C-alpha cells in the first residue's frame, strides 16, 4: 500500500477565504513531505463550492512542489475536455521539471452540468474529447514532429517544449467511476487507473480491478501499486466518537456541496469501508479489509472539508503517520 | 523607477536542460526576493527556443511565489487569444491567493505565426480575442453572477472561484497594439501598459506614453510608476570588456532566437539605451537617460540567456542591487 493526501476543497467564501485555504493547503503539503506520505493530490473543478477553489490543479501543485522535496504531486484529475492538449502537455511538462520528476498525471471525465454549459461543450462527444485529449498529450510528451489530425484539434508537425523530466513522460492514470470498460481500455493503453470506492459497491470495484489486471496482462503490462489510485475521506482522532462527529460533519458538508453542484448513512459508509474515519485502530482494521479486497494500491486520504480547522487536518495526518504509515512501509 | 527581474527563457537543451533552467530560475527568483527587487516576470510562448520552455507562465510563477515572500509575480504576458477567459481567470485567481496578493497580470498580444497556426486561430481575430478576453477576465474577478455574451464565448451566470485576494482584482497591464486607440483604451479602463523600447524607436515609446497619460487624466485615472512596464536585457560586470563580450553574446543569442521564431547591432542597442549592459557606472548613466525620456516606470531586467551560468546572472543582480538600486530608492 501507498498513502498520500488529497486536498479536495469543498468550501466557499462564507466559510473560508481562498487566502486561508491556500496557505493551509500548502502547509498540509509540507506536512505530507515531512511526515513521509507518498504524494499530494488535488482536483480540477469550476464555479461551485464543490471543488471550485481549484479550477487549475497544476497551479496549486507547482506551489506544493516548490515547498517540498520528496512527496510526489498527482493530478486527480485534470479534465482534458476543457483545455487544449498543447496547453495541458506544456504546463504539465513545466511542472514535471519544476518538481524534478515527482509528477503523476491523472486524467478524468467531467460530470458537473454547469461546467459543460459554461465552456459550451456538449456531453455527447465528451468521451471522444477525453480519449483524444489523453492521447494527444501523451504524443506531445513522447514524440517530436507530432502531426495530430484530431477530431477536436489539428496541429503539427510541432515539438512541445519543455520536454518532460521523466522518461518517457509522467505516469498516466485514467479516472473511472463510470464503466469497467474504460478500465479495460486504460490497461490496453498501458495506463494506470483511478477508481471510486466511496460510491461503488465493493464487489464492483473488485470486478473492475479484475478486468483491469486481466487486460493489463494480455497487453504484456504488469501494474504496480502506483498504477491504481483511490481516494477516501479521512479523519482521525484519538477519540473515535469525536472522529465520527467531526469527520461525519465533513463528509456531510462535502455531500451537500456535491448535491448542490450536480444541480445512519455515514455509519453505514464507515462500516462498508467507503470512508476512513475513526481512531487509528478503527482505520487500521478498515485498511486491512480494503487491502484484502483489492490488493496493494495507492490511497489518497482526503483530509480537508468545509470550515474544518487546519489543526484537525494536521492531527489526522500526524496520527496516520505515527500509527499507520510504519506498518505499511 | 522600480526594477524587477525578467526570466524569459531564450534557451534550448544544448545550453540548459529544462530541469536545469527551472532549478536555476527559481533560485534567481529567490535571489530577487533577497536582494530587494520589485518583481519576477516570465512569458507565455510555444515550440521555439524563443520562450518555448514557458508555455504556461502561471505554472512557473506559482512555484516562484511559493519560494519567496515579498517579490511580486508578474505575467509578461498571458495570451488571452489562446485560452478561455474562464480558465485564465481561475488559474490567476489561484495564483493571487497562493502569493498572498503579490500578483500583477500582464496580458499580451501574440505575434508568432507558429503559435496562431498550431492553435488554429486566425490572426485577423487577434485584436477582438484579446480585448474580449481581457474584459471577460476582469469581470470574472470583479463581479459575481457574471454573464458574458461576446463574439467568441457565451457563459453565465457564474461566480468564478476562488475569489481573488486583491480587490477588486490584481493590477491589469496590457500590451499596446501601437495604434493610438489601444493606449487610450487601457487608460480609460484603469489598466497599466507594457511597452517595448528594445525594438521601437524612443519617440514611439514617448508618443504611446503621452497618449496613455493624457487619456488617463481625462478619465480621472492617476497612473503610477507600477502601471508602466518595459523589459531590457541586462548584464553587469565591473570589467567593461567582460560586460560587453558576455552581455553582447547574451543579447545576440536572444535576438537570434527571436529571428528564428518569426521566420555592430548590439553596440548600437547599448548606445541607444535599448539594452542595459556595461559596468555599473555605464548602466547608471543609461538608466538616467531612460528616466529622462520616459519618466518613472517599472523595468524588468532580463538577466538570463542561453548557456550563461547562473552565477553570472546572480552577479548582474548583486551588482545592480549594490550600485544602482539605492540611487532610485
Ligand atoms: Ca497565516
Ligand atoms: Ca524522441
Ligand atoms: Ca542541480
Ligand atoms: Ca517582458
Ligand atoms: Ca486600480
Ligand atoms: Ca514588460
Author numbering:
A (entry chain A), B (entry chain B): 1 to 263, 286 to 351
Mind quoting what the paper says about this structure?
Rishirilides are a group of PKS II secondary metabolites produced by Streptomyces bottropensis Gö C4/4. Structurally, rishirilide is a tricyclic partially aromatic polyketide with an unusual isopentyl sidechain and a carbonyl group on the third ring. In this study the involvement of one cyclase and two oxygenase in rishirilide biosynthesis was investigated. For this purpose, excision of rslC3 gene using the markerless time-saving CRISPR-Cas9 system, inactivation of rslO4 gene using Redirect® technology, and crystallization of RslO4 and RslO1 proteins were carried out.
The monooxygenase RslO1 crystallizes as a homodimer and the overall structure of each subunit is made up of a well-conserved 8 β-strands TIM-barrel surrounded by 8 α-helixes. Each β-strand connects an α-helix through a short loop region. According to the structural homology study using Swiss Model Server, RslO1 was revealed to be FMN-dependent bacterial luciferase-like monooxygenase. RslO1 belongs to the family of FMN-dependent luciferase-like monooxygenases. The RslO1 three-dimensional structure shows a high similarity to FMN-dependent luciferase-like monooxygenases such as the epoxy-forming MsnO8 which acts with the flavin reductase MsnO3 in mensacarcin biosynthesis in the same strain. The high similarity in three-dimensional structure between RslO1 and the epoxy-forming MsnO8 enzyme in mensacarcin biosynthesis in S. bottropensis indicates a similar activity of RslO1 enzyme in the epoxide formation to form RslO5-substrate during rishirilide biosynthesis in the same strain. According to the high sequence identity between RslO2 and MsnO3 (47%), it is most likely that RslO2 acts as flavin reductase, by using NADH as a hydrogen source, to provide RslO1 with the reduced FMN in a similar mechanism of MsnO8-MsnO3 two-component epoxide-forming system. In his turn the FMN-dependent luciferase-like monooxygenase RslO1 is responsible for the formation of an epoxide providing a substrate for RslO5. Following the epoxidation mediated by RslO1-RslO2 system, RslO1 product undergoes an epoxide reduction by RslO5 and then oxidative carbon backbone rearrangement including RslO9-mediated Baeyer–Villiger oxidation and lactone formation.
